[PDB]
C-alpha cells in the first residue's frame, strides 16, 4: 500500500493546473448556488420526513403532556 503499488490504471490522461495560475473561488455563487439547490432537492425527500415526523410527535407529545398536567372538568364537578 504505497504510491506505485496501488492498482493497474491504463490509457487515462489527467490535465491539471497550478493553484497560482488558476482561481481559488471560480464561479462560486454563479454555478454553486444552483448545484447546492440541486443537491438539496436530491436528498430532501429521503432526509427530511423523519425529522418532520419527529417534530410532529415532539410538539404533540409536549402538547398532550401539558393537557394531562392541567385540570380536568370531571374533578368533583356536578358533585358537591
Amino acid at each position: 500500500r504505497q504510491f506505485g503499488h496501488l492498482t493497474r490504471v491504463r490509457h487515462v490522461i489527467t490535465y491539471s493546473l497550478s493553484p497560482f495560475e488558476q482561481r481559488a473561488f471560480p464561479h462560486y455563487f454563479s454555478k454553486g448556488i444552483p448545484n447546492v439547490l440541486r443537491r438539496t432537492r436530491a436528498c430532501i425527500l429521503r432526509v427530511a420526513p423523519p425529522f418532520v415526523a419527529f417534530y410532529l410527535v415532539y410538539t404533540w407529545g409536549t402538547q398532550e403532556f401539558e393537557k394531562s398536567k392541567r385540570k380536568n372538568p370531571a374533578a368533583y364537578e356536578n358533585d358537591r
Binding site: 504510491f3 506505485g4 490504471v9 493553484p19
Partner: peptide
C-alpha cells in the same frame, strides 16, 4: 506514473 508527485 502512479508515484509521480502531486503538483502541489
Amino acid at each position: 506514473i502512479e508515484q509521480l508527485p502531486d503538483y502541489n
